[PDB]
Design a protein around this ligand. Structure first.
Ligand code: HEM
Length: 379
């Protein structure tokens, strides 16, 4: 039993400084300092787990509301399918060749609408929800909140009329506290939207930077779909489309850090994690770690090919985690992302507008500072 090794920082806020200068770089660095190292954020110490084996142990160990399970299981997503198809193909018209797409603005919107319309059905939260959620997300980076609370309440009050078959979360949430619901709703929809949105931005970036897969995706879709606009059933066949998304998520994951708190004194990789300790780890660094991945920084959707897939460590690619603090929408996420990607790559070809700033901006989630793309007519 040995305590973790310290890294290298300054006076009042040791690692706090190297951390703020370049979060992403700091996290990828930690990796070599050892499987687990101790870093000081100002006065308090935190533990950093940088190994795929210990990070899995970290998420699967409970030492760090099934209500929600019935709305996100694989069985409740085939029912959301229509709204997913609907929202996707609607983007396909909404965007037209020649006009640049404002990724931040447009990705955030598709995100809110898919989430809100599948997880809630009826009186539309159309642009109102989007805007409130917009003004808010920007407050974080560097009259909306009220509306958000206003609308969340008002919307709940309307399903109270007739919400018979609504297998959505809202009805799942109404059959388990008065304000607890309003909060468990506001709490689930908020992150999930910004999260899927940031992911969409990187997908748009992938389709413009790699026309080869963009089209390969169009080929795979046309085969399966014939010509009919892609549908849920189709998504379960579009393999390549799925690989592109994973590969894009691996190199640029919306959630790049994760935290845990030790309840009981623990042991990890032969190291002693003090009871009540604050621990941290970066899916970002794990997914881009040379010891886990062959072509470490090479966009390659085909590394997820059976043969090479098995070459990569067990928990080295876990955009969502394993234990209960996992992502309920893992199925619901990939399902809408797959649909939107296939719908977009089939109809279009993407190109980045000169002046586009696809540089990563580290905030709540990782996202491109100012990605500008233009859909070009494919066939
Ligand atoms: C861009 C795709 C997504 C990714 C990569 C993702 C990833 C994650 C991760 C890594 C966690 C927690 C892990 C931890 O701290 O232990 C989480 C939690 C959660 N996510 Fe997702 N997520 C995505 C989309 C969504 C969507 C669309 C929703 C629904 C609006 C959603 C709702 C939630 C909820 C409610 C939790 C909390 C679970 C708990 O309390 O244990 N997520 N997600």
């Amino acid at each position: 039993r040995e305590p973790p090794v310290a890294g290298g920082g300054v006076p009042l806020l040791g690692h706090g400084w190297r951390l703020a200068r370049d979060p992403l770089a700091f996290m990828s660095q930690l990796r070599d300092h050892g499987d687990v190292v101790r870093i000081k954020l100002g006065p308090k110490t935190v533990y950093a787990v940088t190994n795929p084996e210990l990070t899995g142990a970290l998420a699967l160990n409970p030492d760090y509301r099934r209500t929600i399970q019935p709305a996100f299981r694989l069985d409740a997503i085939p029912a959301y399918g229509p709204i997913m198809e609907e929202e996707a193909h609607a983007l396909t018209e909404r965007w037209q060749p020649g006009k640049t797409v404002d990724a931040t603005s447009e990705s955030f919107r598709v995100a809110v609408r898919v989430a809100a319309r599948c997880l809630l059905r009826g009186q539309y939260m159309d642009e109102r929800a989007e805007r409130l959620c917009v003004a808010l997300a920007t407050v974080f980076r560097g009259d909306a909140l009220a509306d958000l609370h206003l609308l969340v309440d008002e919307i709940i009050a309307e399903r109270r009329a007739s919400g018979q078959k609504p297998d959505d979360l809202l009805t799942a949430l109404l059959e388990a506290g008065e304000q607890e619901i309003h909060d468990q709703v506001v709490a689930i929809l908020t992150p999930g939207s910004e999260t899927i949105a940031s992911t969409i931005m990187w997908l748009l970036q992938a389709l413009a930077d790699h026309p080869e897969h963009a089209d390969r995706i169009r080929d795979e879709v046309e085969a399966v779909t014939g010509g009919r606009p892609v549908a849920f059933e189709d998504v379960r066949k579009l393999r390549h489309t799925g690989n592109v998304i994973v590969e894009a998520m691996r190199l640029r994951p919306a959630v790049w850090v994760l935290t845990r708190r030790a309840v009981a004194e623990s042991e990890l990789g032969g190291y002693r994690i003090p009871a009540g300790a604050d621990i941290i780890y970066s899916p970002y660094a794990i997914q881009r770690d040379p010891k886990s991945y062959d072509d470490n920084l090479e966009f390659d959707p085909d590394r997820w090919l059976p043969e090479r897939a098995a070459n990569v460590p067990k928990y080295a690619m876990k955009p969502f985690s394993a234990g209960k603090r996992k992502c309920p929408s893992d199925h619901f996420s990939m399902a809408q992302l797959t649909l939107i990607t296939a719908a977009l790559a089939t109809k279009y070809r993407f190109e980045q507008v000169a002046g586009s700033n696809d540089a990563v901006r580290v905030g709540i989630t990782l996202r491109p500072h100012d990605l500008l793309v233009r859909p070009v007519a494919r066939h």
